[PDB]
Design a protein around this ligand. Sequence first.
Ligand SMILES: *Cc1cc2c(cc1C)nc1c(=O)[nH]c(=O)nc-1n2C[C@H](O)[C@H](O)[C@H](O)COP(=O)(O)OP(=O)(O)OC[C@H]1O[C@@H](n2cnc3c(N)ncnc32)[C@H](O)[C@@H]1O
Ligand SMILES: *Cc1cc2c(cc1C)nc1c(=O)[nH]c(=O)nc-1n2C[C@H](O)[C@H](O)[C@H](O)COP(=O)(O)OP(=O)(O)OC[C@H]1O[C@@H](n2cnc3c(N)ncnc32)[C@H](O)[C@@H]1O
Ligand code: HEM
Ligand code: HEM
Ligand SMILES: [Cl-]
Ligand SMILES: [Cl-]
Lengths: 75, 75, 515, 515
Amino acid sequence: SQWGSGKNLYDKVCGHCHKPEVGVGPVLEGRGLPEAYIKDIVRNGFRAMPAFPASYVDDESLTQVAEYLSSLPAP
Amino acid sequence: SQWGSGKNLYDKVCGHCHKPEVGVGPVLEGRGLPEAYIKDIVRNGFRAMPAFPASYVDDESLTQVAEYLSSLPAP
Amino acid sequence: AVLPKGVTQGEFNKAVQKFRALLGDDNVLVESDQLVPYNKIMMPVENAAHAPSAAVTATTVEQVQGVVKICNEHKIPIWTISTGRNFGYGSAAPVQRGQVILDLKKMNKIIKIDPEMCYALVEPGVTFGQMYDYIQENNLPVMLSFSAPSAIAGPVGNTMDRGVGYTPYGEHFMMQCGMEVVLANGDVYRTGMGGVPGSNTWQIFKWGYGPTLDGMFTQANYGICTKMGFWLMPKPPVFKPFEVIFEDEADIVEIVDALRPLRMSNTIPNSVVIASTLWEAGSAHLTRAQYTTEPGHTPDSVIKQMQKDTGMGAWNLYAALYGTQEQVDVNWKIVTDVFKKLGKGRIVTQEEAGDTQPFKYRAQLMSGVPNLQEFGLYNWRGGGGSMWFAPVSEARGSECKKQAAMAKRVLHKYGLDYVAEFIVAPRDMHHVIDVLYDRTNPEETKRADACFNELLDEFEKEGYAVYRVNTRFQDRVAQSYGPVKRKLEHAIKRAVDPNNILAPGRSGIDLNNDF
Amino acid sequence: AVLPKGVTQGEFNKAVQKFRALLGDDNVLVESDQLVPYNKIMMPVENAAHAPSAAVTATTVEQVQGVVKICNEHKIPIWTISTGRNFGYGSAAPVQRGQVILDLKKMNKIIKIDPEMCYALVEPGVTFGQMYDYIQENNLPVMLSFSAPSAIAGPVGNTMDRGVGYTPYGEHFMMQCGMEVVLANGDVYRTGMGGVPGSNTWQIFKWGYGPTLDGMFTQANYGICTKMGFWLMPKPPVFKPFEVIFEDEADIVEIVDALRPLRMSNTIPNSVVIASTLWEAGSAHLTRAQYTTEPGHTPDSVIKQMQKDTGMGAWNLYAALYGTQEQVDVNWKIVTDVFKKLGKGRIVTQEEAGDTQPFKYRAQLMSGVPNLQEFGLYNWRGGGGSMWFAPVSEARGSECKKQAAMAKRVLHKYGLDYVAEFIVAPRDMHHVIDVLYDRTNPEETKRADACFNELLDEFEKEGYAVYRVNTRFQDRVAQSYGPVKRKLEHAIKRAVDPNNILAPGRSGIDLNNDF
Ligand SMILES: *Cc1cc2c(cc1C)nc1c(=O)[nH]c(=O)nc-1n2C[C@H](O)[C@H](O)[C@H](O)COP(=O)(O)OP(=O)(O)OC[C@H]1O[C@@H](n2cnc3c(N)ncnc32)[C@H](O)[C@@H]1O
Ligand SMILES: *Cc1cc2c(cc1C)nc1c(=O)[nH]c(=O)nc-1n2C[C@H](O)[C@H](O)[C@H](O)COP(=O)(O)OP(=O)(O)OC[C@H]1O[C@@H](n2cnc3c(N)ncnc32)[C@H](O)[C@@H]1O
Ligand code: HEM
Ligand code: HEM
Ligand SMILES: [Cl-]
Ligand SMILES: [Cl-]
């Protein structure tokens, strides 16, 4: 896998901005965010948030991080 | 003058090798070395000794250093 | 329906078929949805102005050589990116609409990290996060230096734009050693000692023999970097980060003049930072909306208030000491003595600042620990608008004060804020100004575009030019340095890339120019 | 009766008349007696092989521009020298017989020395002796860095060949900032911030914007340097030079491995030197004739004896500490602790050494005080024969030991001595070997020529190449770095000097080559 697991992609990339203690981006943990929405935001980018090409974060890793985040309890 | 005086040329160039305390080149002080010989050695260079173009040390300065060295007492 | 400039659909189609034959269909992107992530930009212009016609991903030098061969056959211009996180400078989008992006993110091998000679040799797709993990997992006694984007950015990409970091190894290009590039004709050239068969000094001695060309490739389009080496700082026994808070805008003069000798003597060895109130605030995650919604720039009264309520100063200095406990103690005494004699500045130690921000993220960047805390700057006004205006300056108090006043005036003229910091070297300052605006607001976007133009004009009138700039202004900035320089750059371009296939427009170098 | 290659007497005559009209008769030298001083060489080949056809002296940029115009008109190749003291590397003679020497020695203005930003801007003819005098007369708080020829050598010429010094600013090209060159087409190009009208950061920030080209001009023939800026080290409160004497040839391994960390951490900040017994002896003014007249290399038993009678070791290390008294004391403890733990090496302080040589000249070079003490090397065997064989090496003990053994084997085969020293950077070594021979002896001269050729061959087989070399071997050494590099170098050459008038042959770059 490109990132091995959704938790690893979160720890190495997304979390540097999205973890509760950082606060650069909104909390995503336990927010029930659909996979389609996560892929959409990541591929297009969103205002202050940068976009990531598939070469950096592929579709499978997005599926994984979406499921990982949904499985967590809301902070 | 290019060097102002024979003593200044000696202090800034020749002496760094020829002064008694240095010993890279032989003592020239008070040796009665003819101006013609000094110009020849400086223009042609001599074995371990490098040559100096007129752009670095002109004829007038060689005349002055020759006279200066001859005026000194032999170490 | 985007095609390269001057390339017919027919020729583009032939090139695409060849890229597929060479790289495989999965490595040739031509669909709009596959290209959208590369198009994300923070510059005040519509996405279309920098839309790529396609993107191809290579993982080997041989594939890159194959790509340039095809590019020369069909006159396809390519824009090379490594990790592509060049936010505020054009990000991953090409300098000219229609170029094909050569995306090297997957060519990500860490070739070598020597813990004794202390150096690394890596491929373009390697990120600092990847290297940090490798160094920790292997318990290697070395540390990294990197831009704030740290974890997601990479050394090859950042160094090709001559970026900077915050440790004593902060001048990245200065610490780079050995580089490999694929030239437009397909030849693989290695700088320094790299061309010597059996050589083991490629990452040891910079220059090599004859012309030393690493610099010629940085901020240029004379080759495609496929490998780059650089030196790593040995991990010291003690790391002591600290901050000094100053209350008045005018203090910058005395701050810089007192700091210069400390940097010059190397007593303070790292690239120090002197952050303005709003940079500090943004990095600490405060937003303008929390203090006001009044139009125009943020009122000086709101800023003085912010300082009052947070403890942040007009200027917030972050630096660090490294070495054995004894070396650090001797140097700390010298530093504290300088500031005590100055009679200004509240010194804040790690024990005092503790786990608070922004001290924490600063201390991490100064010790090579990744974090993206500073992206809080993009939340100051939000909307995705951000351009770096980074004029170079003498590390002299009066100069730094003059530039700050000039920038502030122009930014206010356009309703924007002076959000800045001075990145301090012994003699120079990278005076970094983040021109922030709401890119979703058409009117404000036009103002930011005009503002950037005016900042360049006004600074140039006083003999100041920027060291790096976004793709929308690379031709404009090239003009700042004169025609003789540009003419020479185009002569070299003609010689190493006769078909103008390598990122034409990069730094204003384009054979279509009359140079 | 010397003419440039491929230039008829008629075309040469036209050029000389134009040089006279432009520069004045006194600045155009065509008589044998005026040219002989430029012909003095230490290379194992007759003077004729590097005899110039003429020499012209310019004092202004406009004259240099006029010279290249005339050179292009009549296809006259010119060899540019600044102070011309390149002993062991070809001195002031052209790389190819018949070239016209453009002698810039009279273009000697110190344009600026800023004591606060600590930098200098100078012309080619400026010597270190001239700068030293200026600094002392004006009591400027800065210090210089320079090669042993110090007083008579100069920063522009030395840096154009990427020479080195012995203070923390010893890597001269690394400390160079801002350069002006006249291109073959007559254009005056300024690197870095120099092209910006009204700029005050030419000697402040190195890179500028776009490709940074200073490196491209060093060890190259793409332009004629007419101005060069460089950073100066602020004069520290305390300077503490010291020496460590080691008794065995084999100690080099532990010496280098123990030293590396100290250089890497900057605890010892200057370019340290580890001199072999015969280098030490020559610098101390001892000659081979004082110990033996036996043919061949100096017997190991004569050397062990020399060490016994003088106190010199197989390896003699010279280094220094700089800073406040407190910084120096803390670092001295660290250094002495390293050597005490090593269990080898006799430490010699300045108080102990006194005014004795070679400690005195080493201490002066490490603090920017000029002297020509080291020219004693040319008295070891005398006769005027000397070539620098300077392979680059990892600053790793095993590598340095391997190189020393390889050199010693080849030198002994030809009846010559291993006279060397390692100039130590944090990661690299300039392994400097003085190939000394009696040039008045035909047979020994032939042996020295064969020896140098074999040193290059043998080191190349182990993946080692030199960082700089005399004019007789510049083409041979270019071969060491591979065809792709040379091809790129010739493409650039063709682009910036289509007529091949700038020192063709320099670093093996000559449009007459099939590259
Ligand atoms: C948003 C942000 C950005 C930022 C910063 C703080 C924030 C909040 N602070 C910075 C800092 O401290 N120092 C610095 O140098 N930059 C800072 N930035 C801007 C930026 O994001 C980083 O500089 C980032 O590291 C640049 O991105 P990356 O490292 O991913 O490099 P890249 O996009 O791949 O390449 C940059 C440009 O270099 C040329 N290029 C890249 N690869 C090649 C190859 N292989 N061959 C030839 N040229 C290449 C391109 O012009 C590319 O656009
Ligand atoms: C004999 C000797 C020599 C020596 C040394 C010890 C002794 C006993 N120790 C050295 C040392 O510590 N470090 C070092 O770098 N070199 C050492 N040497 C060799 C040499 O003598 C010096 O390096 C000397 O400083 C070189 O001479 P100089 O400084 O006078 O420079 P140059 O002859 O004028 O120029 C050198 C070459 O650069 C190119 N050139 C010069 N000027 C220009 C301009 N204006 N534009 C373009 N190219 C230029 C030429 O190829 C020239 O030959
Ligand atoms: C890691 C690949 C990653 C993911 C996944 C991700 C997702 C994501 C979503 C779904 C949103 C919208 C959340 C919502 O609607 O509540 C969002 C928003 C922002 N992000 Fe993000 N994000 C990932 C990575 C990163 C990184 C590495 C950064 C910091 C550089 C970052 C930042 C932001 C920001 C800021 C926003 C808010 C945008 C806005 O509302 O204007 N994200 N992200
Ligand atoms: C300064 C311009 C200068 C002068 C003048 C000068 C003169 C000179 C003479 C006359 C001799 C020969 C003396 C004799 O026959 O007894 C001589 C010899 C040597 N020199 Fe000299 N010299 C001047 C300058 C310098 C400099 C700057 C150096 C050191 C780099 C130097 C060195 C030498 C050496 C060595 C010799 C002896 C050469 C040999 O026998 O191999 N000189 N000099
Ligand atoms: Cl951008
Ligand atoms: Cl020589």
